């Protein structure tokens, strides 16, 4: 968008509350021990998403950034005015009379915000402004 | 010779070598079997010619390749887009596409 | 099976599924608690 | 320099020719030296078979090498660029006008055109 | 096995001769096999002066007959090798005759990989991504059939108009003009050319699908969804492995033809003329925008 | 080939060395252990080759004698000295034809001279594009 | 405008064969036709800039113009150049010469350099071929001397009509202050040198 990444590893969760509460039968005292890890980053937060096949390569790149996506949808929406109801139907920006889409592009940015037929420079301006990156868009 | 023709010269030069081994096995046969000096007296006047004359033909194919001066490096092609026959033939298809 | 002076420039397994490095990691990990 | 490229290259080719061919020369040559029998112990006669073996096998070997260098030189003659674009099929030139009818009329489809007007 | 026997026996030669020469110089017994020095002390063996000793006719007779057999073995070698070499000529010649069909018919030739074969550019006429066929001998074929990275047996570009139920409406499919050259090999060069062609085009297009959404056009990521009027999808994707409906086949004509013809326009546009006023008229990047302007004629028609 | 080097030097060392070796005879001396160590040394005293291969040499004798059965009385060795002697002369004639031969343009290097001064001529026009002196 | 460039002669005997190794794999061919006037500002006092670049170079591109048409001299497009010299210690390295690519628009054209009073000097015509690589391009040379002063009519006058093809890869930097286009374009055109090395030997020459 200018890193912004996920390292992938292996985890452990010892806790005595299940551990030795049984032990020496159907709960081994040792494990000993290792699991899985996927740490989201940039910025200031780390998701600890469940890690379980069946799985596809796209999910960590997508679904995580889709949570991130609707978090942006509420980001601008609460940075926005009450007068204009941003919905999850598709970023329905509401420059009345017109009501139009707000979306961030998957992968490389230049967000997929869209007018409802053929759009002029408006999308081109906001999105080349996204190419500028600086000065976040809300006001 | 031009284009493939030098290479073609080598192509029919190909069979010119293996039978030299027949001439040579017979070079052995001249005294090992036939027991006649005259035979190898002829085939030493043949084996060396059948070999070396081909060798000279080769070395001259190479030296005159070195005169023809074909570049050895393969050009890395630009992503080519459309040669003219391709373009107008595509247009012919477009007529067919009408 | 059983099993199954030229050119240089051209177009511009590992039968182990990176199993080799996995075994290496097993060497590191068998004593990972121990070391 | 581009010069020494092809020059030292072809020189390697001819040098290789010198290699395999001289190999054939000497290996075919000394078999004649191997022919001696009298005045030598029978056990000393034993190696001569292996000697002839290595000579002849070296010969056909060097011949194969010559096939190699020959194929190489083939590639060098043939690695040259095509003089231009080369003929294929340019047969039957497409209509200019059916194209125009497709363009216009299919784009003019369901339209009240008033011709051209002055 | 055999080399084990003979060579180790020779090791015994070195060892026992070392036992003999260990009577004087000590820098000889040192090379004996390790078990021996642990056992028998050096300087053990000793030579004796004795006898001519004997001789027999078998000496000269075998000395003759074995040399006879040797030179004759050389004869059999030269002759049978002559056979295999001549056969190699017989095989190899077909390759370069088919290369008369190649180079003497003016076709690209380049050094290749570990295949030892040529690296002909089947895509000599051009497209986008470069293409060179891996020439490959096929003993069944007498000739030498060539293939690339394809898993697909054949490929092109199906198109059709999905309804609201995504039922068929308009439809068509791409077809190349048919080469009829004397060499079927060159014809397959044309075929693989056609494949790399459909590749580079549709791959470039769906790669360009990027900002298709500005006038409602969308994507399953499989191909081109076209959410325009009356809920429809002009599906356009790679091949597996009345008069007004014929005129629907004609809308499909403008699509099929003029799109590839825009592959050609982009054969012009990939020439990187990259003219500035269009750069004012466009954002990113080298992208032809094969799609939008035409359907803009279509929606201006609307 | 390396083995050919081995047989080369070894056969080289057979030479007149055999003239001395024929009188030679192996025997273990005073430090040689006596109780039961001997038999392996008897194998060391055993000049026997492969029994199958000695059988092969016997096969060569008996079957050359079978050729003699095909050819009951035919001396050849006396003139076989001239077999190998004709090898000895024909090898020399072979060498003669070898010496008669020519063996392995340089002008190609002078092709570089064409681009020698052409580079200097490259210096020429640039000097005009530079100074323009006439 | 910091042009980066090299030089390598091509004999005409191998020229078009080289072009086959070029134009098929490159943009173009584009024939060049541009009438020079390298006017010399004979001026006082020393130390004059006096360097060949310091002398003015009006540059009339005329490649689309007729070989006999009369409106050319001040109607067909002109230009002007002083240009900085290529860098000192630019050994083997592509020469880096900053360039003032002048343009103009009036029926008066040449006149202003004589409005600056500058004297006439040597003249020629770029007439080689050029093959694109984005902002970078190669420019193999032909610089025939014109048959007469201010005469567009051929035959012209190469120092030999066995004219060297002064092959010349180049690029044009906007500004030399950053390292970016420096190493970048030097790399791209060094690879271009690897391309020509399949059929030629370019070199730097001092300027």
Curated annotation (Swiss-Prot), chain B:
Its main location: cytoplasm. InterPro entries: Mediator_Med11. One of its GO terms (molecular function) is transcription coactivator activity. GO terms for cellular component: cytoplasm; mediator complex; nucleus. The keyword Nucleus applies. It comes from the Eukaryota. It is found in: Cytoplasm; Nucleus. Transmembrane segments: none annotated. Coiled coil: none annotated. GO terms for biological process: positive regulation of transcription initiation by RNA polymerase II. Keywords: Cytoplasm, Nucleus. The keyword Lipid metabolism does not apply. Component of the Mediator complex, which is composed of at least 21 subunits that form three structurally distinct submodules. The Mediator head module, the middle module, and the tail module. The head and the middle modules interact directly with RNA polymerase II, whereas the elongated tail module interacts with gene-specific regulatory proteins. Med11 is part of the head module. Forms a heterodimer with med22. The med11/22 heterodimer binds to and stabilizes the central head subunit med17. Component of the Mediator complex, a coactivator involved in the regulated transcription of nearly all RNA polymerase II-dependent genes. Mediator functions as a bridge to convey information from gene-specific regulatory proteins to the basal RNA polymerase II transcription machinery. Mediator is recruited to promoters by direct interactions with regulatory proteins and serves as a scaffold for the assembly of a functional pre-initiation complex (PIC) with RNA polymerase II and the general transcription factors. The gene is med11.
UniProtKB/Swiss-Prot annotation, chain C:
It is found in: Nucleus. Component of the Mediator complex, a coactivator involved in the regulated transcription of nearly all RNA polymerase II-dependent genes. Mediator functions as a bridge to convey information from gene-specific regulatory proteins to the basal RNA polymerase II transcription machinery. Mediator is recruited to promoters by direct interactions with regulatory proteins and serves as a scaffold for the assembly of a functional preinitiation complex with RNA polymerase II and the general transcription factors. Component of the Mediator complex. Belongs to the Mediator complex subunit 6 family. This is Mediator of RNA polymerase II transcription subunit 6. It comes from Schizosaccharomyces pombe (strain 972 / ATCC 24843) (Fission yeast).
From Swiss-Prot, chain E:
It comes from the Eukaryota. Residues 40-53 have a biased composition (Polar residues). Residues 39-59 are annotated as: Disordered. It is found in: Nucleus. GO terms for cellular component: core mediator complex; mediator complex. Its main location: nucleus. GO terms for molecular function: transcription coactivator activity; transcription coregulator activity. Keywords: Activator, Nucleus, Transcription, Transcription regulation. One of its GO terms (biological process) is regulation of transcription by RNA polymerase II. Component of the Mediator complex, a coactivator involved in the regulated transcription of nearly all RNA polymerase II-dependent genes. Mediator functions as a bridge to convey information from gene-specific regulatory proteins to the basal RNA polymerase II transcription machinery. Mediator is recruited to promoters by direct interactions with regulatory proteins and serves as a scaffold for the assembly of a functional preinitiation complex with RNA polymerase II and the general transcription factors. Component of the Mediator complex. Interacts with med18, prk1 and rbp1. Belongs to the Mediator complex subunit 17 family. This is Mediator of RNA polymerase II transcription subunit 17. The lineage of its organism: Eukaryota, Fungi, Dikarya, Ascomycota, Taphrinomycotina. The gene is med17.
From Swiss-Prot, chain F:
Keywords: Activator, Nucleus, Transcription, Transcription regulation. GO terms for molecular function: RNA polymerase II cis-regulatory region sequence-specific DNA binding; transcription coactivator activity; transcription coregulator activity. It comes from the Eukaryota. One of its GO terms (cellular component) is nucleus. Component of the Mediator complex, a coactivator involved in the regulated transcription of nearly all RNA polymerase II-dependent genes. Mediator functions as a bridge to convey information from gene-specific regulatory proteins to the basal RNA polymerase II transcription machinery. Mediator is recruited to promoters by direct interactions with regulatory proteins and serves as a scaffold for the assembly of a functional preinitiation complex with RNA polymerase II and the general transcription factors. Belongs to the Mediator complex subunit 8 family. This is Mediator of RNA polymerase II transcription subunit 8.
């Amino acid at each position: 968008q200018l890193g912004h990444y996920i390292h992938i590893f292996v985890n452990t969760q010892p806790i005595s509350a299940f551990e030795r509460t049984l032990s020496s039968k159907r709960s081994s005292c040792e494990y000993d021990h290792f699991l899985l890890l996927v740490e989201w980053h940039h910025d200031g937060i780390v998701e600890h998403v469940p890690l379980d096949d069946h799985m596809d390569a796209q999910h960590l790149l997508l679904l995580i950034t889709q949570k991130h996506a609707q978090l942006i949808l509420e980001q601008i929406r609460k940075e926005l005015h009450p007068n204009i109801f941003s919905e999850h139907v598709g970023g329905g920006l509401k420059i009345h009379v017109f009501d139009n889409e707000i979306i961030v592009k998957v992968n490389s940015v230049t967000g997929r915000l869209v007018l409802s037929l053929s759009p002029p420079r408006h999308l081109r301006a906001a999105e080349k402004n996204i190419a500028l990156n600086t000065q976040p868009p809300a006001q | 010779s031009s284009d493939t023709q030098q290479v073609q010269n080598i192509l029919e030069l190909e069979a010119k070598i293996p039978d030299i081994l027949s001439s040579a096995g017979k070079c052995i046969e001249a005294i090992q079997l036939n027991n006649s000096l005259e035979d190898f007296r002829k085939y030493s006047k043949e084996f060396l010619e059948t070999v070396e004359f081909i060798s000279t033909g080769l070395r001259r194919q190479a030296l005159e390749l070195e005169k023809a001066e074909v570049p050895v490096v393969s050009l890395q092609p630009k992503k080519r887009y459309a040669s003219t026959p391709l373009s107008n033939l595509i247009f012919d298809q477009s007529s067919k596409l009408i | 099976d059983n099993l199954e002076e030229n050119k240089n420039q051209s177009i511009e397994p590992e039968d182990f599924s990176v199993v080799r490095a996995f075994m290496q990691s097993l060497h590191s990990s068998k004593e990972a608690p121990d070391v | 320099s581009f010069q020494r490229q092809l020059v030292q290259r072809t020189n390697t080719l001819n040098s290789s020719i010198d290699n395999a061919t001289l190999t054939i020369l000497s290996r075919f040559q000394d078999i004649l030296d191997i022919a001696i029998n009298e005045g030598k112990d029978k056990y000393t006669v034993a190696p001569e078979v292996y000697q002839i073996e290595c000579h002849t096998v070296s010969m056909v070997r060097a011949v194969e090498q010559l096939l190699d260098v020959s194929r190489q030189i083939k590639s060098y003659w043939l690695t040259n660029s095509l003089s231009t674009s080369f003929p294929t099929v340019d047969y039957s030139e497409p209509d200019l006008e059916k194209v125009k009818r497709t363009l216009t009329k299919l784009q003019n489809h369901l339209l009240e055109v008033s011709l051209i007007e002055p | 096995e055999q080399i084990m026997i003979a060579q180790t026996e020779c090791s015994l030669a070195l060892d026992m001769t070392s036992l003999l020469l260990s009577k004087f110089k000590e820098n000889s017994i040192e090379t004996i096999s390790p078990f021996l020095k642990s056992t028998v002390p050096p300087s053990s063996l000793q030579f004796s002066r004795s006898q001519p000793p004997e001789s027999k006719e078998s000496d000269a007779t075998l000395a003759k007959c074995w040399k006879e057999k040797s030179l004759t073995s050389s004869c059999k070698f030269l002759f049978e090798a002559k056979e295999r070499l001549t056969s190699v000529v017989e095989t190899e010649h077909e390759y370069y005759t088919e290369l008369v069909k190649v180079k003497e018919a003016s076709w690209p030739l380049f050094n290749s990989q570990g295949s030892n074969h040529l690296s002909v550019q089947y895509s000599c006429l051009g497209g986008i991504s470069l293409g060179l066929g891996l020439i490959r001998m096929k003993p069944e074929s007498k000739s030498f059939e060539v293939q690339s990275s394809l898993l697909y047996s054949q490929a092109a570009l199906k198109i059709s108009i999905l309804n609201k139920d995504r039922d068929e409406i308009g439809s068509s499919t791409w077809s190349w003009p048919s080469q009829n050259c004397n060499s079927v090999l060159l014809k397959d060069i044309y075929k693989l050319q056609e494949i790399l062609f459909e590749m580079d085009i549709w791959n470039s297009l769906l790669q360009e699908a990027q900002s298709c959404g500005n006038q409602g056009v969308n994507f399953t990521g499989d191909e081109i969804l076209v959410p325009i009027s009356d809920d429809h999808v002009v599906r356009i994707t790679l091949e597996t492995s009345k008069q007004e409906k014929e005129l629907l086949k004609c809308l499909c004509d403008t699509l099929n033809a003029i799109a590839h013809i825009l592959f050609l326009k982009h054969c012009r546009k990939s020439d990187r003329r990259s003219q500035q006023p269009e750069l004012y008229m466009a954002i990113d990047a080298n992208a032809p925008l094969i799609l939008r302007p035409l359907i803009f004629y279509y929606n201006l028609n609307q | 080939n390396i083995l050919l080097s081995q047989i080369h030097s070894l056969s080289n060392n057979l030479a007149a060395h055999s003239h001395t070796l024929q009188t030679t005879s192996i025997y273990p001396s005073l430090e040689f252990p006596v109780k039961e160590q001997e038999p392996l040394l008897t194998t060391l005293l055993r000049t026997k080759a492969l029994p199958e291969v000695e059988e092969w040499e016997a096969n060569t004798l008996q079957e050359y004698e079978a050729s003699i059965s095909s050819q009951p009385k035919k001396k050849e060795a006396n003139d076989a000295y001239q077999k190998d002697q004709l090898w000895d002369q024909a090898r020399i004639i072979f060498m003669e034809e070898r010496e008669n031969y020519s063996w392995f343009r340089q002008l190609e290097i002078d092709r570089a001279t064409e681009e020698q001064n052409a580079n200097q001529m490259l210096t020429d026009i640039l000097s005009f594009m530079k100074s323009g002196k006439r | 405008m910091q042009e980066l460039y090299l030089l390598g002669v091509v004999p005409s005997r191998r020229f078009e064969a080289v072009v086959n190794s070029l134009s098929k794999t490159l943009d173009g061919p584009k024939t060049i036709l541009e009438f020079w006037v390298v006017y010399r500002p004979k001026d006082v006092p020393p130390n004059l800039p006096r360097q060949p670049d310091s002398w003015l170079r009006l540059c009339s591109n005329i490649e689309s113009h007729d070989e006999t048409d009369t409106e050319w001299s001040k109607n067909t497009q002109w230009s002007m150049y002083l240009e900085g010299n290529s860098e000192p210690k630019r050994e083997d390295k592509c020469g880096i010469r900053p360039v003032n690519r002048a343009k103009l628009t009036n029926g008066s054209v040449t006149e202003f350099v004589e409005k600056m009073g500058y004297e006439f000097s040597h003249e020629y015509i770029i007439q080689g071929l050029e093959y694109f690589f984005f902002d970078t391009t190669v420019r193999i040379y032909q610089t025939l001397i014109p048959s007469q002063q201010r005469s567009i009519k051929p035959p012209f006058h190469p120092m030999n009509e066995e004219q060297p093809w002064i092959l010349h890869v180049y690029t044009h930097v906007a500004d030399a202050s950053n390292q970016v286009a420096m190493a970048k374009a030097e790399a791209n055109l060094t690879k271009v040198k690897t391309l020509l090395s399949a059929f030629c030997d370019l070199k730097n020459v001092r300027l």
